[PDB]
Amino acid sequence: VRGAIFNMIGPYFNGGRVLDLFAGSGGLAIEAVSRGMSAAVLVEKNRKAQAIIQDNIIMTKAENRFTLLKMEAERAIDCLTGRFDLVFLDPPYAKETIVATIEALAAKNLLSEQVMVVCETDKTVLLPKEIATLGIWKEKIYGISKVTVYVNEGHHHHHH
Amino acid sequence: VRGAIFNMIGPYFNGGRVLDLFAGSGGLAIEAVSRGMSAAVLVEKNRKAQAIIQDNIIMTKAENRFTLLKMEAERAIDCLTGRFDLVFLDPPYAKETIVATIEALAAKNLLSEQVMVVCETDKTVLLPKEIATLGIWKEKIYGISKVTVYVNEGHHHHHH
Ligand SMILES: OC[C@H]1O[C@H](O)[C@H](O)[C@@H](O)[C@@H]1O
């Protein structure tokens, strides 16, 4: 569904910083940078996922644009600084706390003025229309998952 | 002071990852990227230093190349994953912390084969010739400071 997600929020980007809080294989972050983002911070504590991410980043030929952090998402939010323009939140079902996480990101001033938060959850997960200062821009349900995209009030339209 | 330091280890670089522990104002990491390093991870626990770093990062017009972590160096090392090509160390309890930090970095396999670990300390601080698998390559004293650079046994000779 990589192409599906990017057809929603992209397909191409104008640079910026990406935060992938539950990076997994690194797919989301890597493709985002590929499609136009400048750099990406990937957070994934899963030992097995690490090796895969490492290899995927090296295969991009622009590996230095990726920073992998082996830590819990909550911990990462309390240690990262600066601001992110695109945030990917695809937590495993049992650890999913989209609302709390976005509120934390906003409270820690980790979101850029023009920010987009892409959430991937089970199809059955209901999310509020507004979280912090963000609002749902798009929501698509395909297969057993649902992708919900939050953006800041006044987020600029995407250029085609 | 930076001109002297970089004439020792540079003066230019063709890409790579920088790690600036006990970053302070982040001056070394920023200059290293300006000279050719690809990206930098800076770790600084002090709140005032963090503010300064964030501001300096903006003045580079290439802020997307920096990742600032607000955490203890020890904690940071346990969360880092990529191999680093250039490491800057200027910590409190210099001699003690430099040895412990290099030992930790080496144990976590966070140093590239051709890594340069650059230590800036008071002129009187005496550092050991060897730490873990590293050894002193260069050491220069000027003004009221001393720069010591550690490298791995297989470090390649540098150009002039
Ligand atoms: O927040 C989303 C926006 O982030 C950055 O500004 C990107 O350059 C832009 O392409 C993207 O639409």
Side-chain angles (χ1 to χ4, degrees), chain A residues 9 12-16 37 85-86 114-116 155 158:
Chain A
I9 69 174
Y12 297 102
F13 304 112
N14 293 166
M37 296 304 298
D85 309 286
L86 177 56
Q114 290 288 135
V115 68
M116 180 162 54
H155 189 276
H158 285 47

PDB file of all heavy atoms in Angstrom, chain A residues 9 12-16 37 85-86 114-116 155 158, ligand 1:
ATOM      1  N   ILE A   9      -0.927  11.589   0.113  1.00  0.00           N
ATOM      2  CA  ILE A   9      -0.182  12.734   0.625  1.00  0.00           C
ATOM      3  C   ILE A   9       0.831  13.369  -0.318  1.00  0.00           C
ATOM      4  O   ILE A   9       1.301  14.477  -0.065  1.00  0.00           O
ATOM      5  CB  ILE A   9       0.551  12.355   1.932  1.00  0.00           C
ATOM      6  CG1 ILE A   9       1.682  11.368   1.638  1.00  0.00           C
ATOM      7  CG2 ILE A   9      -0.430  11.708   2.900  1.00  0.00           C
ATOM      8  CD1 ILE A   9       2.551  11.052   2.850  1.00  0.00           C
ATOM      9  N   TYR A  12       4.639  13.657  -4.782  1.00  0.00           N
ATOM     10  CA  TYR A  12       5.992  14.182  -4.612  1.00  0.00           C
ATOM     11  C   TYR A  12       6.041  15.270  -3.554  1.00  0.00           C
ATOM     12  O   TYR A  12       5.035  15.920  -3.291  1.00  0.00           O
ATOM     13  CB  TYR A  12       6.507  14.695  -5.958  1.00  0.00           C
ATOM     14  CG  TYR A  12       6.617  13.574  -6.964  1.00  0.00           C
ATOM     15  CD1 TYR A  12       5.656  13.407  -7.965  1.00  0.00           C
ATOM     16  CD2 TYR A  12       7.629  12.619  -6.857  1.00  0.00           C
ATOM     17  CE1 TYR A  12       5.699  12.311  -8.824  1.00  0.00           C
ATOM     18  CE2 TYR A  12       7.679  11.523  -7.713  1.00  0.00           C
ATOM     19  CZ  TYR A  12       6.711  11.375  -8.690  1.00  0.00           C
ATOM     20  OH  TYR A  12       6.746  10.273  -9.517  1.00  0.00           O
ATOM     21  N   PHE A  13       7.213  15.464  -2.953  1.00  0.00           N
ATOM     22  CA  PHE A  13       7.383  16.462  -1.895  1.00  0.00           C
ATOM     23  C   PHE A  13       8.415  17.545  -2.204  1.00  0.00           C
ATOM     24  O   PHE A  13       9.261  17.384  -3.082  1.00  0.00           O
ATOM     25  CB  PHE A  13       7.769  15.765  -0.586  1.00  0.00           C
ATOM     26  CG  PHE A  13       6.789  14.715  -0.150  1.00  0.00           C
ATOM     27  CD1 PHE A  13       7.143  13.372  -0.160  1.00  0.00           C
ATOM     28  CD2 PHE A  13       5.505  15.067   0.257  1.00  0.00           C
ATOM     29  CE1 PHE A  13       6.235  12.391   0.228  1.00  0.00           C
ATOM     30  CE2 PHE A  13       4.590  14.095   0.647  1.00  0.00           C
ATOM     31  CZ  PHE A  13       4.955  12.756   0.631  1.00  0.00           C
ATOM     32  N   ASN A  14       8.342  18.638  -1.448  1.00  0.00           N
ATOM     33  CA  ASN A  14       9.236  19.784  -1.621  1.00  0.00           C
ATOM     34  C   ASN A  14      10.319  19.917  -0.551  1.00  0.00           C
ATOM     35  O   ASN A  14      10.705  21.031  -0.196  1.00  0.00           O
ATOM     36  CB  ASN A  14       8.417  21.079  -1.649  1.00  0.00           C
ATOM     37  CG  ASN A  14       7.529  21.185  -2.873  1.00  0.00           C
ATOM     38  OD1 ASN A  14       6.626  22.022  -2.926  1.00  0.00           O
ATOM     39  ND2 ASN A  14       7.790  20.350  -3.872  1.00  0.00           N
ATOM     40  N   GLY A  15      10.804  18.792  -0.036  1.00  0.00           N
ATOM     41  CA  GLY A  15      11.839  18.839   0.984  1.00  0.00           C
ATOM     42  C   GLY A  15      11.290  18.948   2.395  1.00  0.00           C
ATOM     43  O   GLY A  15      10.107  19.233   2.586  1.00  0.00           O
ATOM     44  N   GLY A  16      12.152  18.727   3.383  1.00  0.00           N
ATOM     45  CA  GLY A  16      11.730  18.804   4.772  1.00  0.00           C
ATOM     46  C   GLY A  16      12.221  17.622   5.586  1.00  0.00           C
ATOM     47  O   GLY A  16      12.943  16.769   5.071  1.00  0.00           O
ATOM     48  N   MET A  37      11.379  14.355   0.154  1.00  0.00           N
ATOM     49  CA  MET A  37      11.732  14.836   1.486  1.00  0.00           C
ATOM     50  C   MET A  37      13.256  14.866   1.613  1.00  0.00           C
ATOM     51  O   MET A  37      13.960  14.097   0.956  1.00  0.00           O
ATOM     52  CB  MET A  37      11.096  13.949   2.562  1.00  0.00           C
ATOM     53  CG  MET A  37       9.558  13.974   2.565  1.00  0.00           C
ATOM     54  SD  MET A  37       8.750  15.748   2.741  1.00  0.00           S
ATOM     55  CE  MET A  37       9.452  16.181   4.485  1.00  0.00           C
ATOM     56  N   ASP A  85       8.258  18.005   9.465  1.00  0.00           N
ATOM     57  CA  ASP A  85       7.255  18.406   8.483  1.00  0.00           C
ATOM     58  C   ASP A  85       6.297  17.278   8.101  1.00  0.00           C
ATOM     59  O   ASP A  85       5.157  17.524   7.696  1.00  0.00           O
ATOM     60  CB  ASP A  85       7.963  18.930   7.234  1.00  0.00           C
ATOM     61  CG  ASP A  85       9.001  19.996   7.562  1.00  0.00           C
ATOM     62  OD1 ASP A  85       8.597  21.130   7.879  1.00  0.00           O
ATOM     63  OD2 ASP A  85      10.217  19.695   7.523  1.00  0.00           O
ATOM     64  N   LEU A  86       6.772  16.044   8.223  1.00  0.00           N
ATOM     65  CA  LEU A  86       5.973  14.868   7.898  1.00  0.00           C
ATOM     66  C   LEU A  86       6.233  13.811   8.963  1.00  0.00           C
ATOM     67  O   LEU A  86       7.373  13.411   9.182  1.00  0.00           O
ATOM     68  CB  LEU A  86       6.368  14.322   6.521  1.00  0.00           C
ATOM     69  CG  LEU A  86       5.680  13.037   6.037  1.00  0.00           C
ATOM     70  CD1 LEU A  86       4.168  13.214   6.055  1.00  0.00           C
ATOM     71  CD2 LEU A  86       6.159  12.715   4.617  1.00  0.00           C
ATOM     72  N   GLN A 114       3.781  23.906   9.103  1.00  0.00           N
ATOM     73  CA  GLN A 114       3.112  23.185   8.028  1.00  0.00           C
ATOM     74  C   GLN A 114       3.468  21.725   8.240  1.00  0.00           C
ATOM     75  O   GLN A 114       4.486  21.251   7.744  1.00  0.00           O
ATOM     76  CB  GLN A 114       3.631  23.653   6.668  1.00  0.00           C
ATOM     77  CG  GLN A 114       3.201  25.062   6.309  1.00  0.00           C
ATOM     78  CD  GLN A 114       1.726  25.142   5.974  1.00  0.00           C
ATOM     79  OE1 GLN A 114       1.022  26.048   6.423  1.00  0.00           O
ATOM     80  NE2 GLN A 114       1.251  24.192   5.171  1.00  0.00           N
ATOM     81  N   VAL A 115       2.638  21.015   8.990  1.00  0.00           N
ATOM     82  CA  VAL A 115       2.916  19.618   9.263  1.00  0.00           C
ATOM     83  C   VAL A 115       1.801  18.694   8.817  1.00  0.00           C
ATOM     84  O   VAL A 115       0.628  19.078   8.752  1.00  0.00           O
ATOM     85  CB  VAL A 115       3.161  19.389  10.768  1.00  0.00           C
ATOM     86  CG1 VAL A 115       1.872  19.620  11.543  1.00  0.00           C
ATOM     87  CG2 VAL A 115       3.687  17.982  11.003  1.00  0.00           C
ATOM     88  N   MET A 116       2.190  17.464   8.515  1.00  0.00           N
ATOM     89  CA  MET A 116       1.266  16.430   8.098  1.00  0.00           C
ATOM     90  C   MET A 116       1.573  15.189   8.947  1.00  0.00           C
ATOM     91  O   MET A 116       2.717  14.756   9.022  1.00  0.00           O
ATOM     92  CB  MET A 116       1.483  16.151   6.606  1.00  0.00           C
ATOM     93  CG  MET A 116       0.623  15.099   5.990  1.00  0.00           C
ATOM     94  SD  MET A 116       0.679  15.345   4.055  1.00  0.00           S
ATOM     95  CE  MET A 116       2.577  15.301   3.780  1.00  0.00           C
ATOM     96  N   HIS A 155      -2.965  24.549   6.627  1.00  0.00           N
ATOM     97  CA  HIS A 155      -1.960  23.807   5.874  1.00  0.00           C
ATOM     98  C   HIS A 155      -2.128  24.186   4.401  1.00  0.00           C
ATOM     99  O   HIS A 155      -3.247  24.191   3.893  1.00  0.00           O
ATOM    100  CB  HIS A 155      -2.182  22.303   6.056  1.00  0.00           C
ATOM    101  CG  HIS A 155      -1.078  21.453   5.510  1.00  0.00           C
ATOM    102  ND1 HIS A 155      -1.007  21.076   4.186  1.00  0.00           N
ATOM    103  CD2 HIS A 155       0.013  20.921   6.111  1.00  0.00           C
ATOM    104  CE1 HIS A 155       0.078  20.348   3.995  1.00  0.00           C
ATOM    105  NE2 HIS A 155       0.715  20.239   5.148  1.00  0.00           N
ATOM    106  N   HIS A 158      -1.508  21.082  -1.660  1.00  0.00           N
ATOM    107  CA  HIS A 158      -0.389  20.402  -2.298  1.00  0.00           C
ATOM    108  C   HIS A 158      -0.363  20.744  -3.786  1.00  0.00           C
ATOM    109  O   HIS A 158      -1.386  20.668  -4.462  1.00  0.00           O
ATOM    110  CB  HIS A 158      -0.520  18.888  -2.129  1.00  0.00           C
ATOM    111  CG  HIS A 158      -0.179  18.398  -0.756  1.00  0.00           C
ATOM    112  ND1 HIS A 158      -0.666  18.989   0.390  1.00  0.00           N
ATOM    113  CD2 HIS A 158       0.587  17.358  -0.346  1.00  0.00           C
ATOM    114  CE1 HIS A 158      -0.216  18.334   1.447  1.00  0.00           C
ATOM    115  NE2 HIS A 158       0.546  17.340   1.026  1.00  0.00           N
TER     116      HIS A 158
HETATM  117  O1  LIG C   1       3.408  19.144   5.713  1.00  0.00           O
HETATM  118  C1  LIG C   1       3.496  18.590   4.396  1.00  0.00           C
HETATM  119  C2  LIG C   1       4.495  19.400   3.561  1.00  0.00           C
HETATM  120  O2  LIG C   1       5.794  19.349   4.221  1.00  0.00           O
HETATM  121  C3  LIG C   1       6.802  20.110   3.489  1.00  0.00           C
HETATM  122  O3  LIG C   1       6.437  21.497   3.449  1.00  0.00           O
HETATM  123  C4  LIG C   1       6.963  19.540   2.059  1.00  0.00           C
HETATM  124  O4  LIG C   1       7.944  20.303   1.354  1.00  0.00           O
HETATM  125  C5  LIG C   1       5.607  19.622   1.333  1.00  0.00           C
HETATM  126  O5  LIG C   1       5.736  19.088   0.007  1.00  0.00           O
HETATM  127  C6  LIG C   1       4.592  18.790   2.135  1.00  0.00           C
HETATM  128  O6  LIG C   1       3.313  18.849   1.482  1.00  0.00           O
END
